[PDB]
Each structure stands twice: as C-alpha cells, then as structure tokens.
Amino acid sequence: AIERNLARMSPLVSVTPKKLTWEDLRPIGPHIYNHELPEVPYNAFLLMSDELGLANMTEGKSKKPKTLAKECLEKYSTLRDQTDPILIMKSEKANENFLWKLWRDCVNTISNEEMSNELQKTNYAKWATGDGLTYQKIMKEVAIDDETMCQEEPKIPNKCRVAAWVQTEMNLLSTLTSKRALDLPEIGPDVAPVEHVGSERRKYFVNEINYCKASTVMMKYVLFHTSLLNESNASMGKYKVIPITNRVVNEKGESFDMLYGLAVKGQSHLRGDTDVVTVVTFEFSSTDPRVDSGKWPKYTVFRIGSLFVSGREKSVYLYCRVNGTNKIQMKWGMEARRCLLQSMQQMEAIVEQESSIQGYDMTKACFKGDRVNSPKTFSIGTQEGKLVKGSFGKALRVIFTKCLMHYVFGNAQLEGFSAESRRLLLLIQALKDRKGPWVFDLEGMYSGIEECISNNPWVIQSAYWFNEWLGFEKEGSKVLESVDEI
C-alpha cells in the first residue's frame, strides 16, 4: 500500500536537494551593511570599557558601601563639591535639570553622618524613577462600551547597522590590566596528585583571566546585581542610593576600592518575575561622548571635573541614564561568575588533549613553552586584511570576553541567532572536512537566521565577524580544489 500510494502522489512533493558549495554561502545579514539605518547604540546596563573607578587604598577589610563611597568621594572632594553642571550631551526625552538634581541628592545623601541611604521622593526623583505611570485597571463592561480603547500595536525592534564601538569593547576588554578583581575563596588542601595538577594548572588559567579588564567588569556587574537584589527585596517602597563598587588588588598586594558611580533604585514591589524596577545610574568616565556620538543617544553626559592620574589631565564626565531590570536579570547577574568555567574548560580540554600526545603535563608548554615544545598560538585577529596569531592566554581572554558578552548583551535575539547559525557553522565544518554536504532548502536557513538580527549589538557584530570569518574560510579552501591536479 505504500508503493501504490507513492506511485500516485505528485512529483512536486520532493526534498529538491541541492549540493552545497562555497559559492552558495552568501554573507548573512546584508542590511547591517547599508548606511541608511542608524548604527546600534550602547544599551548595556553599566559602562564596560569606558568605566573609571575612583580608587582609595584600604587595609584588606570590609565595611558598609555607603562608607566606602563616602571615603572614595572624600579623597576626590573636587568632583564631590562640583555643583555647577556643564551639559555636554542630552538624551531626547530626558531632563538635564532633574538628573543633575538627582546627582546632587545622591552625593549629599551618600556623604552625611546618618547610616541610612534612603532618598526622599521629590519631583525629580519621581520623574527619574517613574511614579504613577501605570495605567488604571477598569472593568470590562465599562471598557467594552468604550470606542477609544483599542489594543495597542506592540513595538517591533528596530533594524540597525554595524557600530564600530563593539569591536572597540572586544579589543579593550581582552587586554591585561594590573588589577585583580576576582574574589575566589579557598579549597581544601591537596593530597592526591590530580589535585596538585589542578592547582598548578589553575595558577596559570586563573591569572590570565584575573588580570584582564573583563574580569573587573564582570565583578562590577556581579556585586551591583547582588546589592541591588538585596535592596529591592529589603526596602520596597523606598528610593535608595546604591553605590557601584568593586574591590581590587594590584601586583604588589595593596588593596583598593574602586567606586564607578552611584545608582538610584525605584520602588520595587516586584510580584511577577518580569516586573521592572527602575534604576537611574550615574557613572564616572573619562571618554568624550562627542568623539563617537552615535554610541550614546541614551545617556545624558555632564562634565564634573578633571583628574591627574600620573601627570596628565584627564577630564571626568558623568553619564546619567534611566534604566531598569527585573528579578530574572538580577538573578542571572548574581550567577555571572560562570563565564570563567565556559572559558576555562574549553581551553583546559585543549591542554588535556596536548598531554595525551606528549605524556607529561602541558600547561607551561602551552602558555610559555619549554625546551622541546614551542608555545601554542591561535589565529585570533585581523590586521590590514591579514591574519594575526596570539598566545594561549589571549585566546582564553577572548573566549572569556565572548562568554561575558553573551550575558551582558543577551536576549531572545541572541538565543535565536546562535541556535540558527550553529547549523550554518556545522555546514561550513562539513565543507571543510570534505564530507560533501547537501542542503534541501538553504534560503529558509538564511531567512530563519536573519530575522533575529534587529538591534542587539552582539548579534550584529557576530554577523559581521561571521561574514569576515567566512570570507577567510573561502579563500583558504582553494588548496582543497587543487588536490591530485589532473
């Protein structure tokens, strides 16, 4: 009965399979290349590579974050006492007067002698947090008899093009610093030789992550989300000042307290998990917002003073932004240290795959080298259209930065983009292994990929890097067509 049902079905019901070649691999996302669309702005929570911390040396202790911010501002009292706003950049639907009044309220409340960091509900605080903006719930008959109450058209994300700052963040966060912001606790003493091997390998794998800038940014995010969740559940009907802090250790062991800004919490009676609490963040920086003004249309920037780092005069700008979060993003911000593991294991497995080829441990022989083995190098960059190799530790920092940008710029667009471009990665891999892959409907694959590229900066720069990497994979495959040369 199957042979007779297949003999009478139409010949139009088929897979129509097409043999995949390199020429069928067009670049994904052409609309990110055209210049009519605006370039994608900065929409992260806190500043990442444009950050600037106000250091203050301490003696390896803990204290209240109010007293930490109070001492860090007492050191830099010139920036604390500046009561004259020099407006540089203003967001469109913002209020430069209300945001400067809120900054002065945060400074005057974080620097008094009371132990309470609560903020009074003035008109500028009620504007910046948003008070009475929820709609009234009326009954269904009173609204069914109405004719003006229509169902709203829900907003679709915009379409943006490649902004040049995402490459700048990727380049700057992968570079080493001299500070160590990690707070890794102790484990038990070692008895088995596997524990000694793990500790010796951790002393390589953890320092490279620890000195880079991305770990400092990660710890800033983790500590701010922890204190913000605690103050959201603790004091619900209160506006509270929450200082953005981090504790940092230099190369000689002297601790410091970096204060990156202040942040106001709204009124968080968060019942549902997707309910939003409004956070108004004021953050210090030294980056002129008019160099790259297509990056900050969401920020209101003031110029509040100048600093002398060693002998040079860097300006200090204040970036003010209304923002928001929910309980789910705060919970995933507390669990944001796991970007270590996904970066460490993927490299550590590689080290283990070296050791089975060589018989001994190859962590020093991959990070630094030895008498026999050369150091390990990976293609990791691009300079003037050519390749750039780097060390094992630079590749570890690059994967750690990638796994941090998965958290910071991570929404449903990134989920859909990764899940739909993984198939295209596996098709490119099947072309590289000379397995000879076949596709049935390739344009459906591209059409399913391209619907998630709307306004996420990591998705647009990932499409840009995929096009660049695919162009590098096409021109290197020409030695595979030249085999047997008949």
Partner 1 sequence: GMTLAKIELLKQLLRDNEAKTVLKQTTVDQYNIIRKFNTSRIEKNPSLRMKWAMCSNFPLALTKGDMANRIPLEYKGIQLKTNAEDIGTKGQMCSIAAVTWWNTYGPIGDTEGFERVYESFFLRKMRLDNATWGRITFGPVERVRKRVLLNPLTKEMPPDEASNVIMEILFPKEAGIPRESTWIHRELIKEKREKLKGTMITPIVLAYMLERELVARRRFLPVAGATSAEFIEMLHCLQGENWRQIYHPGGNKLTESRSQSMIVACRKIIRRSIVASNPLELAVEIANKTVIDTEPLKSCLAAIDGGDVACDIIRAALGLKIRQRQRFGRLELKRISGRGFKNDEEILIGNGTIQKIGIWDGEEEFHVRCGECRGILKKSKMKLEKLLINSAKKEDMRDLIILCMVFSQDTRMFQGVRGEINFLNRAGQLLSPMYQLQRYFLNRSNDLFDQWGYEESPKASELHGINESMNASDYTLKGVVVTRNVIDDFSSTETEKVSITKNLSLIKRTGEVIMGANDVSELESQAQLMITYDTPKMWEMGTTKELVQNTYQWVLKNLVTLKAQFLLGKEDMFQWDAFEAFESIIPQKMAGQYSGFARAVLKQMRDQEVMKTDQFIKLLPFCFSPPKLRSNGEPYQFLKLVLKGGGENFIEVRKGSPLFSYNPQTEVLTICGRMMSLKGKIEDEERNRSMGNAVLAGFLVSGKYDPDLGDFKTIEELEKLKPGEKANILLYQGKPVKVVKR
Partner 2 sequence: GMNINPYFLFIDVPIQAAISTTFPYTGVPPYSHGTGTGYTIDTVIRTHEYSNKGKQYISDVTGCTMVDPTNGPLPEDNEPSAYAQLDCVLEALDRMDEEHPGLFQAASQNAMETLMVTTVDKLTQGRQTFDWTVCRNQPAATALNTTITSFRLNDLNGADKGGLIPFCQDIIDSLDRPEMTFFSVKNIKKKLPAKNRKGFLIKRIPMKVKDKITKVEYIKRALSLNTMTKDAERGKLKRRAIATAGIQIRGFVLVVENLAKNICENLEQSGLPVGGNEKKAKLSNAVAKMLSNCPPGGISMTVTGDNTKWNECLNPRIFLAMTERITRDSPIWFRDFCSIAPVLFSNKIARLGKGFMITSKTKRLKAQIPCPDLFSIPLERYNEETRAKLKKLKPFFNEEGTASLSPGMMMGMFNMLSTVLGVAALGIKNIGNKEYLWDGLQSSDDFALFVNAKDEETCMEGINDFYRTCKLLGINMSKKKSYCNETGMFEFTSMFYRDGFVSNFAMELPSFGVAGVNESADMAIGMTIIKNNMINNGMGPATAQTAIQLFIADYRYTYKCHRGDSKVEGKRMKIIKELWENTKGRDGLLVADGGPNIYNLRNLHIPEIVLKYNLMDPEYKGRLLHPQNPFVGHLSIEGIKEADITPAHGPVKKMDYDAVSGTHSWRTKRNRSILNTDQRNMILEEQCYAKCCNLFEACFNSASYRKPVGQHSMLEAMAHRLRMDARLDYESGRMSKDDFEKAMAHLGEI
Partner RNA sequence: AAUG
Partner RNA sequence: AGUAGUAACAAGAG
Partner RNA sequence: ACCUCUGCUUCUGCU
By CB under 7 A, name the binding residues for RNA: 43, 91-94, 128-137, 139, 141, 152, 154-158, 233, 236-237, 266-267, 269-276, 278, 298, 322-326, 329, 411-413, 455
Q: In 10 A of CB 403, how many CB atoms? A: 20
3-state secondary structure of 314: strand
User: Of these partners, RNA, partner 1, partner 2, none, which one is at the site of residue 359 (CB under 5 to 8 Å by kind)?
Assistant: partner 1
Q: Nearest distance from residue 14's CB to partner 1, in Å?
A: 23
Nearer to RNA, 126 or 314 (CB): 126
Could you say which residues in the range 89-118 bind partner 1, by CB under 8 A? none
Q: Which residues lie closer than 8 Å to 165 by C-beta, 6 or more apart?
A: 42, 292, 295
Could you say which residues in the range 361-380 bind partner 1, by CB under 8 A? 361
Q: Nearest distance from residue 133's CB to partner 2, in Å?
A: 8
Could you say which residues in the range 464-483 bind partner 1, by CB under 8 A? 476-477, 479-480, 482-483
User: Of these partners, partner 2, RNA, partner 1, none, which one is at the site of residue 307 (CB under 5 to 8 Å by kind)?
Assistant: none
CA pair distance 358, 11, nearest whole angstrom: 58
3-state secondary structure of 106: helix
User: Of these partners, partner 2, partner 1, RNA, none, which one is at the site of residue 419 (CB under 5 to 8 Å by kind)?
Assistant: partner 2
Nearer to partner 2, 118 or 273 (CB): 273
In terms of Cα–Cα distance, which of 374, 406, 371 is closest to 392?
374
Q: Please pick, from the candidates 193, 253, 272, 385, the single residue that binds partner 1 as defined by CB under 8 A.
A: 193
Distances (CA, A) of 132 to 127, 267, 281: 10, 11, 21
User: Of these partners, partner 1, RNA, partner 2, none, which one is at the site of residue 344 (CB under 5 to 8 Å by kind)?
Assistant: partner 2
CA pair distance 282, 263, nearest whole angstrom: 6
User: Of these partners, RNA, partner 1, partner 2, none, which one is at the site of residue 477 (CB under 5 to 8 Å by kind)?
Assistant: partner 1
Residue 194, interface with partner 1 (CB under 8 A)? yes
Give the burial string for 153-186 (b: 16+ CB within 10 Å, else e). Answer: eeeeeebbbbbebbeebbebbbeebebbbbeeee
Nearer to partner 2, 14 or 310 (CB): 14
3-state secondary structure of 12: coil
3-state secondary structure of 67: helix
CA pair distance 365, 200, nearest whole angstrom: 13
Nearer to RNA, 61 or 93 (CB): 93
**Under 8 Å between Cβ of 19 and 436:** yes
Nearer to RNA, 367 or 409 (CB): 409
User: Of these partners, partner 1, partner 2, RNA, none, which one is at the site of residue 83 (CB under 5 to 8 Å by kind)?
Assistant: none
Rg (CA), the chain: 27
Distances (CA, A) of 299 to 91, 96, 192, 422: 6, 10, 54, 35
Q: Nearest distance from residue 190's CB to partner 1, in Å?
A: 10
Return residues touching partner 1 (CB under 8 A).
Answer: 191-194, 197, 229-230, 232-234, 273, 327-328, 331, 334-335, 352-353, 355-361, 432-434, 436, 476-477, 479-480, 482-486
